[PDB]
Amino acid sequence: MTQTPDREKALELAVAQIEKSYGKGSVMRLGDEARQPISVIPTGSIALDVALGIGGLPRGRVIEIYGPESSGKTTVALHAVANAQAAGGVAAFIDAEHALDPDYAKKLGVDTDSLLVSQPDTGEQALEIADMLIRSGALDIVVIDSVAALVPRAELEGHVGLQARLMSQALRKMTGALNNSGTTAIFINQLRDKIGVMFGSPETTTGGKALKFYASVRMDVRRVETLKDGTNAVGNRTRVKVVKNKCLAPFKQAEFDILYGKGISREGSLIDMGVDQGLIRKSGAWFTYEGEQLGQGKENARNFLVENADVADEIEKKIKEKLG
Ligand SMILES: Nc1ncnc2c1ncn2[C@@H]1O[C@H](COP(=O)(O)OP(=O)(O)OP(O)(O)=S)[C@@H](O)[C@H]1O
Protein backbone atom coordinates (compact mmCIF):
# COMPACT_ATOMS: atom_id res chain seq x y z
CA MET A 1 0.00 0.00 0.00
CA THR A 2 1.20 3.49 -0.95
CA GLN A 3 0.03 4.67 2.50
CA THR A 4 2.00 7.08 4.71
CA PRO A 5 0.05 9.68 6.76
CA ASP A 6 -3.38 8.08 7.26
CA ARG A 7 -1.34 5.18 8.64
CA GLU A 8 -0.38 7.06 11.79
CA LYS A 9 -4.03 7.98 12.25
CA ALA A 10 -5.52 4.48 12.26
CA LEU A 11 -2.56 3.49 14.39
CA GLU A 12 -3.22 6.31 16.87
CA LEU A 13 -6.86 5.18 16.90
CA ALA A 14 -5.98 1.50 17.32
CA VAL A 15 -3.84 2.27 20.36
CA ALA A 16 -6.70 4.33 21.80
CA GLN A 17 -9.18 1.45 21.67
CA ILE A 18 -6.65 -0.99 23.13
CA GLU A 19 -5.74 1.36 25.95
CA LYS A 20 -9.48 1.84 26.58
CA SER A 21 -10.32 -1.81 27.25
CA TYR A 22 -7.07 -3.08 28.76
CA GLY A 23 -5.53 -0.10 30.52
CA LYS A 24 -3.54 3.11 29.97
CA GLY A 25 -0.25 1.24 29.86
CA SER A 26 -1.32 -1.67 27.68
CA VAL A 27 0.72 -0.37 24.75
CA MET A 28 3.57 2.13 24.68
CA ARG A 29 6.56 3.21 22.64
CA LEU A 30 9.88 2.80 24.43
CA GLY A 31 10.42 6.49 23.73
CA ASP A 32 7.04 7.87 24.77
CA GLU A 33 7.32 10.71 27.27
CA ALA A 34 6.34 9.22 30.63
CA ARG A 35 3.07 10.05 32.40
CA GLN A 36 2.96 11.76 35.81
CA PRO A 37 0.59 10.84 38.66
CA ILE A 38 0.03 12.91 41.82
CA SER A 39 1.09 10.32 44.37
CA VAL A 40 4.27 8.30 44.11
CA ILE A 41 6.74 6.86 46.64
CA PRO A 42 10.34 7.88 46.14
CA THR A 43 12.69 4.89 46.30
CA GLY A 44 15.28 7.03 48.00
CA SER A 45 17.66 7.20 45.01
CA ILE A 46 16.82 9.87 42.46
CA ALA A 47 18.51 7.57 39.93
CA LEU A 48 16.07 4.66 40.36
CA ASP A 49 13.23 7.15 40.79
CA VAL A 50 13.84 8.52 37.35
CA ALA A 51 14.26 5.09 35.85
CA LEU A 52 10.89 4.08 37.14
CA GLY A 53 9.61 6.97 35.04
CA ILE A 54 7.08 8.46 37.48
CA GLY A 55 9.75 9.58 39.95
CA GLY A 56 9.10 6.86 42.52
CA LEU A 57 6.89 3.83 43.13
CA PRO A 58 3.29 3.68 41.83
CA ARG A 59 0.48 3.51 44.38
CA GLY A 60 -2.25 0.86 44.55
CA ARG A 61 -0.07 -1.39 42.42
CA VAL A 62 1.78 -4.63 43.11
CA ILE A 63 5.55 -4.14 42.79
CA GLU A 64 7.97 -7.06 42.56
CA ILE A 65 11.60 -6.81 43.52
CA TYR A 66 13.65 -9.90 42.68
CA GLY A 67 17.30 -10.82 42.46
CA PRO A 68 20.13 -12.59 44.36
CA GLU A 69 20.71 -12.58 48.12
CA SER A 70 22.40 -9.36 49.16
CA SER A 71 21.68 -7.49 45.95
CA GLY A 72 19.70 -4.78 47.71
CA LYS A 73 15.98 -5.60 47.54
CA THR A 74 15.18 -5.23 51.25
CA THR A 75 17.04 -1.92 51.50
CA VAL A 76 15.26 -0.60 48.42
CA ALA A 77 12.09 -1.89 50.08
CA LEU A 78 12.71 -0.47 53.52
CA HIS A 79 13.45 2.86 51.83
CA ALA A 80 10.20 2.74 49.89
CA VAL A 81 8.86 2.19 53.41
CA ALA A 82 10.71 5.00 55.20
CA ASN A 83 9.64 7.44 52.49
CA ALA A 84 5.97 6.50 52.49
CA GLN A 85 6.34 6.77 56.25
CA ALA A 86 7.80 10.30 56.33
CA ALA A 87 4.68 11.63 54.65
CA GLY A 88 2.69 10.30 57.58
CA GLY A 89 1.74 7.07 55.85
CA VAL A 90 1.48 3.76 57.71
CA ALA A 91 3.41 0.68 56.58
CA ALA A 92 3.20 -3.03 57.41
CA PHE A 93 5.82 -5.76 56.96
CA ILE A 94 4.63 -9.35 56.62
CA ASP A 95 7.61 -11.43 57.73
CA ALA A 96 8.12 -15.00 56.51
CA GLU A 97 11.89 -15.27 56.93
CA HIS A 98 12.54 -13.47 60.18
CA ALA A 99 15.59 -11.56 58.90
CA LEU A 100 14.72 -7.95 59.56
CA ASP A 101 17.23 -5.86 61.53
CA PRO A 102 15.39 -2.80 62.96
CA ASP A 103 18.58 -1.03 63.99
CA TYR A 104 19.52 -0.92 60.30
CA ALA A 105 16.06 -0.06 59.02
CA LYS A 106 16.09 2.65 61.71
CA LYS A 107 19.20 4.29 60.30
CA LEU A 108 17.37 4.27 56.96
CA GLY A 109 14.66 6.52 58.33
CA VAL A 110 11.99 3.94 59.15
CA ASP A 111 9.98 4.69 62.26
CA THR A 112 10.30 1.09 63.34
CA ASP A 113 8.37 1.78 66.52
CA SER A 114 5.12 2.23 64.57
CA LEU A 115 6.01 -0.24 61.87
CA LEU A 116 3.36 -2.95 61.64
CA VAL A 117 4.98 -6.34 61.47
CA SER A 118 3.32 -9.74 61.15
CA GLN A 119 4.95 -13.16 61.23
CA PRO A 120 2.37 -15.59 59.71
CA ASP A 121 2.25 -19.29 60.51
CA THR A 122 1.42 -20.48 57.02
CA GLY A 123 1.63 -19.07 53.52
CA GLU A 124 -2.07 -18.45 52.99
CA GLN A 125 -2.23 -16.74 56.35
CA ALA A 126 0.41 -14.26 55.23
CA LEU A 127 -1.47 -13.21 52.11
CA GLU A 128 -4.84 -13.06 53.88
CA ILE A 129 -3.58 -11.03 56.83
CA ALA A 130 -2.04 -8.82 54.18
CA ASP A 131 -5.39 -8.68 52.46
CA MET A 132 -7.54 -7.42 55.33
CA LEU A 133 -4.73 -5.18 56.43
CA ILE A 134 -4.87 -3.81 52.86
CA ARG A 135 -8.67 -3.52 52.61
CA SER A 136 -8.90 -1.24 55.65
CA GLY A 137 -7.81 1.51 53.29
CA ALA A 138 -5.55 2.43 56.17
CA LEU A 139 -2.17 1.17 54.90
CA ASP A 140 -0.07 3.14 52.46
CA ILE A 141 2.65 0.62 51.71
CA VAL A 142 2.68 -3.10 52.59
CA VAL A 143 5.76 -5.30 52.15
CA ILE A 144 5.75 -9.13 52.02
CA ASP A 145 9.29 -10.32 52.62
CA SER A 146 10.26 -13.27 50.50
CA VAL A 147 7.81 -14.98 48.20
CA ALA A 148 9.58 -18.33 48.52
CA ALA A 149 8.77 -18.47 52.23
CA LEU A 150 5.00 -18.46 51.87
CA VAL A 151 4.74 -22.26 52.23
CA PRO A 152 1.12 -23.57 51.78
CA ARG A 153 -0.78 -24.81 54.82
CA ALA A 154 -0.87 -28.14 52.99
CA GLU A 155 2.86 -28.71 52.55
CA LEU A 156 3.10 -27.52 56.13
CA GLU A 157 1.29 -30.78 57.02
CA GLY A 158 0.58 -33.33 54.23
CA HIS A 159 1.02 -33.01 46.88
CA VAL A 160 1.93 -30.61 43.99
CA GLY A 161 2.08 -26.98 42.66
CA LEU A 162 0.51 -25.56 45.81
CA GLN A 163 2.49 -22.33 46.20
CA ALA A 164 1.75 -21.35 42.61
CA ARG A 165 -2.04 -21.22 42.87
CA LEU A 166 -2.00 -20.00 46.43
CA MET A 167 -0.36 -16.95 44.93
CA SER A 168 -2.70 -16.87 41.94
CA GLN A 169 -5.81 -16.89 44.06
CA ALA A 170 -4.31 -14.50 46.59
CA LEU A 171 -3.15 -12.03 43.94
CA ARG A 172 -6.44 -12.14 42.09
CA LYS A 173 -8.44 -11.29 45.20
CA MET A 174 -5.83 -8.88 46.56
CA THR A 175 -5.20 -7.10 43.27
CA GLY A 176 -8.62 -5.45 43.40
CA ALA A 177 -8.38 -4.13 46.98
CA LEU A 178 -5.01 -2.53 46.32
CA ASN A 179 -6.23 -0.44 43.36
CA ASN A 180 -9.21 0.53 45.49
CA SER A 181 -7.12 2.04 48.28
CA GLY A 182 -4.00 3.31 46.56
CA THR A 183 -2.06 0.95 48.80
CA THR A 184 1.03 -0.23 46.97
CA ALA A 185 2.44 -3.65 47.81
CA ILE A 186 6.08 -4.75 47.44
CA PHE A 187 6.83 -8.46 47.11
CA ILE A 188 10.45 -9.33 47.82
CA ASN A 189 11.46 -12.30 45.67
CA GLN A 190 14.71 -14.14 46.21
CA LEU A 191 16.30 -16.21 43.46
CA ARG A 192 18.55 -18.62 45.38
CA ASP A 193 20.51 -18.79 42.10
CA LYS A 194 23.73 -17.38 40.57
CA ILE A 195 25.54 -20.43 39.15
CA GLY A 196 24.59 -20.27 35.47
CA VAL A 197 27.02 -19.10 32.80
CA MET A 198 29.44 -16.31 33.69
CA PHE A 199 27.34 -13.84 35.64
CA GLY A 200 23.72 -13.27 36.59
CA SER A 201 20.39 -14.15 34.96
CA PRO A 202 16.54 -13.94 35.33
CA GLU A 203 13.79 -16.49 36.26
CA THR A 204 10.59 -16.96 38.34
CA THR A 205 8.66 -20.17 39.18
CA THR A 206 8.85 -20.27 43.01
CA GLY A 207 5.28 -19.08 43.13
CA GLY A 208 6.41 -16.42 40.70
CA LYS A 209 4.59 -16.88 37.38
CA ALA A 210 1.42 -15.41 38.90
CA LEU A 211 3.34 -12.45 40.31
CA LYS A 212 5.35 -11.87 37.12
CA PHE A 213 2.05 -10.98 35.41
CA TYR A 214 -0.12 -9.41 38.11
CA ALA A 215 2.85 -7.24 39.05
CA SER A 216 2.75 -3.83 37.36
CA VAL A 217 6.42 -3.15 37.97
CA ARG A 218 9.19 -5.66 38.31
CA MET A 219 12.69 -4.74 39.42
CA ASP A 220 15.76 -6.90 38.75
CA VAL A 221 18.29 -6.04 41.44
CA ARG A 222 21.84 -7.33 41.34
CA ARG A 223 25.18 -6.35 42.84
CA VAL A 224 27.65 -4.87 40.36
CA GLU A 225 30.84 -4.22 42.39
CA THR A 226 31.91 -4.11 46.05
CA LEU A 227 32.63 -0.38 46.48
CA LYS A 228 36.28 0.10 47.50
CA ASP A 229 36.90 2.86 50.03
CA GLY A 230 40.68 2.89 50.20
CA THR A 231 40.17 0.98 53.45
CA ASN A 232 37.93 -2.09 53.02
CA ALA A 233 34.48 -1.54 51.51
CA VAL A 234 31.99 1.23 52.29
CA GLY A 235 29.21 -0.46 50.34
CA ASN A 236 28.35 -2.00 46.96
CA ARG A 237 27.22 -0.63 43.62
CA THR A 238 23.72 -1.92 42.99
CA ARG A 239 22.22 -2.05 39.50
CA VAL A 240 18.44 -2.26 39.14
CA LYS A 241 16.68 -2.92 35.88
CA VAL A 242 12.94 -2.42 35.71
CA VAL A 243 11.96 -5.11 33.24
CA LYS A 244 8.26 -4.49 33.68
CA ASN A 245 6.51 -1.19 34.16
CA LYS A 246 2.88 -0.72 33.12
CA CYS A 247 3.19 2.91 34.14
CA LEU A 248 6.08 4.27 32.05
CA ALA A 249 8.24 2.95 29.21
CA PRO A 250 10.00 -0.19 30.60
CA PHE A 251 13.53 -1.61 30.36
CA LYS A 252 15.28 1.38 31.95
CA GLN A 253 18.13 0.79 34.36
CA ALA A 254 19.82 2.47 37.32
CA GLU A 255 22.86 2.14 39.56
CA PHE A 256 23.62 3.44 43.00
CA ASP A 257 25.73 2.88 46.09
CA ILE A 258 24.53 1.21 49.28
CA LEU A 259 26.85 1.87 52.23
CA TYR A 260 27.28 -0.92 54.76
CA GLY A 261 24.91 -0.19 57.62
CA LYS A 262 23.93 3.10 55.94
CA GLY A 263 21.79 2.00 52.99
CA ILE A 264 21.20 3.89 49.71
CA SER A 265 23.44 6.97 49.47
CA ARG A 266 21.09 9.77 48.43
CA GLU A 267 23.96 12.22 48.05
CA GLY A 268 25.85 9.74 45.88
CA SER A 269 22.87 9.52 43.53
CA LEU A 270 22.72 13.31 43.38
CA ILE A 271 26.28 13.58 42.11
CA ASP A 272 26.08 10.86 39.45
CA MET A 273 22.79 11.99 37.96
CA GLY A 274 24.22 15.41 38.70
CA VAL A 275 27.04 15.12 36.17
CA ASP A 276 25.01 13.08 33.69
CA GLN A 277 22.79 16.15 33.48
CA GLY A 278 25.29 18.95 32.95
CA LEU A 279 24.32 20.44 36.31
CA ILE A 280 27.49 19.27 38.03
CA ARG A 281 30.90 19.77 36.43
CA LYS A 282 33.84 17.41 36.94
CA SER A 283 37.18 19.18 36.46
CA GLY A 284 39.47 16.17 36.84
CA ALA A 285 39.36 14.84 40.40
CA TRP A 286 37.37 17.99 41.22
CA PHE A 287 33.57 18.09 41.41
CA THR A 288 32.24 21.57 40.76
CA TYR A 289 28.64 22.74 40.93
CA GLU A 290 27.38 26.08 39.61
CA GLY A 291 30.80 27.61 40.18
CA GLU A 292 32.08 26.98 43.72
CA GLN A 293 33.59 23.52 44.35
CA LEU A 294 32.22 20.43 46.11
CA GLY A 295 35.19 18.16 46.62
CA GLN A 296 38.02 16.07 45.20
CA GLY A 297 36.67 12.59 44.53
CA LYS A 298 33.16 11.17 44.64
CA GLU A 299 33.40 10.46 48.37
CA ASN A 300 34.61 13.91 49.41
CA ALA A 301 31.68 15.17 47.35
CA ARG A 302 29.15 12.80 48.85
CA ASN A 303 30.36 13.95 52.25
CA PHE A 304 30.16 17.63 51.24
CA LEU A 305 26.66 17.05 49.94
CA VAL A 306 25.74 15.01 52.99
CA GLU A 307 26.56 17.75 55.48
CA ASN A 308 25.34 20.61 53.31
CA ALA A 309 21.78 19.32 53.26
CA ASP A 310 20.82 22.83 52.10
CA VAL A 311 22.69 22.59 48.78
CA ALA A 312 21.89 18.92 48.10
CA ASP A 313 18.18 19.66 47.97
CA GLU A 314 19.01 22.39 45.44
CA ILE A 315 20.58 19.80 43.16
CA GLU A 316 17.89 17.15 43.63
CA LYS A 317 15.42 19.92 42.75
CA LYS A 318 16.88 21.08 39.44
CA ILE A 319 17.25 17.52 38.15
CA LYS A 320 13.54 17.38 38.93
CA GLU A 321 12.73 20.51 36.92
CA LYS A 322 14.95 19.13 34.14
CA LEU A 323 12.77 16.01 33.75
CA GLY A 324 10.42 15.69 36.75
N1 LIG B 1 21.18 -5.46 59.21
C2 LIG B 1 22.13 -4.99 58.35
N3 LIG B 1 23.29 -4.50 58.88
C4 LIG B 1 24.27 -4.02 58.05
N5 LIG B 1 24.26 -3.96 56.70
C6 LIG B 1 23.09 -4.46 56.17
C7 LIG B 1 21.99 -4.98 56.90
N8 LIG B 1 21.00 -5.38 56.05
C9 LIG B 1 21.50 -5.11 54.84
N10 LIG B 1 22.76 -4.55 54.83
C11 LIG B 1 23.50 -4.17 53.56
O12 LIG B 1 22.60 -3.96 52.47
C13 LIG B 1 22.95 -4.76 51.28
C14 LIG B 1 21.85 -5.73 50.87
O15 LIG B 1 20.54 -5.40 51.34
P16 LIG B 1 19.76 -6.67 51.93
O17 LIG B 1 18.87 -6.25 53.06
O18 LIG B 1 20.68 -7.81 52.27
O19 LIG B 1 18.78 -7.05 50.66
P20 LIG B 1 18.69 -8.23 49.57
O21 LIG B 1 17.39 -7.61 49.25
O22 LIG B 1 20.07 -7.81 49.28
O23 LIG B 1 18.63 -9.19 50.86
P24 LIG B 1 19.05 -10.78 51.17
O25 LIG B 1 18.19 -11.08 49.88
O26 LIG B 1 20.47 -10.32 50.90
S27 LIG B 1 18.37 -10.38 52.97
C28 LIG B 1 24.31 -5.40 51.60
O29 LIG B 1 25.38 -4.89 50.80
C30 LIG B 1 24.49 -5.22 53.13
O31 LIG B 1 25.80 -4.92 53.56
User: Domains of the chain (ranges plus CATH)?
Assistant: 28-264 (3.40.50.300), 265-324 (3.30.250.10)
Closest C-alpha to ligand 1, atom 28: 70
Cβ neighbours of residue 14 closer than 8 Å, sequence gap 6 or more: none
Q: Is the CB of 216 within 6 Å of ligand 1?
A: no
Q: Which atom of ligand 1 is nearest to the CA of 73?
A: 21
Q: Is the CB of 102 within 6 Å of ligand 1?
A: no
Q: How many CA atoms lie within 13 A of 186 on its CB side?
A: 29
Q: Is the CB of 97 within 6 Å of ligand 1?
A: no
Q: What are phi and psi of 258, to 5 degrees?
A: -125, 105
Closest CA to 223 of 206, 208, 241, 205: 241
User: Binding site annotation covers 68?
Assistant: yes
Q: How far is the CA of 75 from the centre of ligand 1 (A)?
A: 6
Buried b (16+ CB within 10 A) or exposed e, 294-320: bbeebbebbebbeeeeebbeebbeebe
Q: Is the CB of 261 within 6 Å of ligand 1?
A: yes
d(CA 27, CA 115): 37
C-alpha torsion angle, residues 170, 174, 176, 178 (rounded to 10): -150
Determination technique for this entry: X-ray
d(CA 131, CA 23): 24
Task: Please say whether the dihedral angle defined by the alpha carbons of residues 310, 109, 129 and 145, taken in this order, is positive or negative.
Answer: positive
DSSP 161: S
Closest CA to 46 of 273, 223, 219: 273
Count Cβ atoms below 10 Å from residue 277 Cβ, excluding itself.
14
Entry resolution in angstroms? 3.2
Closest C-alpha to ligand 1, atom 17: 74
d(CA 218, CA 212): 7
d(CA 76, CA 189): 13
C-alpha torsion angle, residues 136, 138, 141, 143 (rounded to 10): -50
Q: How far is the CA of 246 from the centre of ligand 1 (A)?
A: 28
Position 222, amino acid:
R
Residue from 63, 65, 70 to probe ligand 1 pocket by mutation (most atoms less than 8 Å from CB): 70
Cβ neighbours of residue 293 closer than 8 Å, sequence gap 6 or more: 286, 287
